[PDB]
């Protein structure tokens, strides 16, 4: 069929074309999340270990782990579940789903490398891709570089270039949940108005009781 291989470490991704008959059948009657062995798939893959994460059968339908079974059953799908995107609030949908168990009907097999091996595949364990963002919060950048609550962050965050015509303008995140005076000011206003409304409420409560004291007698 057509393999789909992920490298979690580097981040690299490359598809593989293997047509080799008796090599494919190692995947067969093995479910999603089970580890293969490398040599059986090909010579270069020797020494490796895979984990089958899903796929699409020759009609395109996605794999869903947990069905067991080799074949497509139409399922009633909800939010917070696979193979479904709930275009409307509270919407559920009957949709076809390919089983977890691997079989020859698959167009693409999805597997990620759990550990490497003897040789090394080009464009996979060759290069390594960058993750395009960096911590946008207080304690993320903190625990990223192993810092404290007084270490701030600021100049410890990430910046990117983006040339504009001639020269550049560099940009950087807003660091939400940062500790600022206005925040402590806002807490001040609140922690205060609690009591300001507290005493004055007991006042006008006793201030009324002057009435009901002298009130009646009639």
């Amino acid at each position: 069929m057509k393999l789909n291989i992920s490298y979690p470490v580097n981040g690299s991704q490359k598809t593989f074309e293997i047509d080799d008959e008796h090599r494919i059948r190692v995947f067969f009657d093995k479910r999603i999340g089970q580890e293969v062995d490398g040599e059986a798939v090909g010579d270069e893959f020797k020494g490796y270990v895979f984990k089958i994460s899903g796929g699409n059968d020759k009609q395109g339908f996605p794999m869903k782990q947990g069905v067991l079974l080799p074949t497509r059953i139409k399922l009633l799908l909800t939010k917070n579940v696979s193979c479904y995107r709930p275009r409307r609030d509270g919407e559920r949908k009957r949709k076809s789903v390919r089983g977890a168990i691997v079989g020859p009907d698959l167009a693409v097999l999805a597997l990620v490398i759990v550990k490497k091996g003897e040789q090394e595949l080009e464009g996979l364990t060759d290069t390594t891709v960058p993750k395009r963002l960096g911590p946008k919060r207080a304690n993320n950048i903190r625990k990223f570089f192993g810092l404290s609550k007084e270490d701030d962050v600021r100049d410890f965050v990430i910046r990117r270039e983006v040339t504009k015509g001639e020269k550049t303008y560099t940009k950087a995140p807003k660091i939400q949940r940062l500790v600022t005076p206005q925040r402590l000011q806002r807490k001040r206003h609140q922690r205060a108005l609690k009591v300001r409304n507290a005493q004055a409420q007991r006042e006008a409560a006793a201030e009324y009781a002057q009435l009901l004291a002298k009130r009646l007698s009639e």
Partner: protein, 135 residues
């Protein structure tokens, strides 16, 4: 070739042997022998027929291979850069001891600390650039 499975017993159905029923609702049933199929036709219950697989699952018969062994792990990973931050660029900022951080602090901490007082009367300064502003 594909070993199928008896929809009643749970027995392995090799090519050839057995029958295939197609119910009017299109649900498919495979039987490995005229016994199973007959039970099905008698409308019997595979959960109550002792030799069936479904029965001895429902009765927890056999088993114990899972109790005998447990397997896990085989996980780990390293880290990689960020667009805008090269690896060594990150290895330099993660590196420094708090003594460099402590020095870095007060240099900027006291820097704008003076810009706070220069600004503090700067509203008072533009208060002296316009008050009443006659003629």
């Amino acid at each position: 070739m594909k070993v199928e499975i008896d929809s009643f017993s749970g027995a392995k159905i090799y090519p050839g042997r057995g029958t295939l029923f197609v119910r009017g609702d299109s649900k498919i049933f495979r039987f490995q022998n005229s016994k199973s199929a007959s039970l099905f036709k008698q409308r019997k219950n595979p959960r109550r027929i002792a030799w069936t697989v479904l029965f001895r699952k429902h009765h927890k018969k056999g088993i114990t291979e899972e109790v005998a062994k447990k397997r896990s792990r085989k996980t780990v990973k390293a880290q990689r850069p960020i667009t805008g931050a090269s690896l060594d660029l990150i290895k330099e900022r993660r590196s420094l001891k708090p003594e460099v951080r402590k020095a870095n602090r007060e240099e900027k901490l006291k820097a704008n600390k003076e810009k706070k007082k220069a600004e503090k009367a700067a509203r008072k300064a533009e208060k002296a650039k316009s008050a009443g502003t006659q003629s």
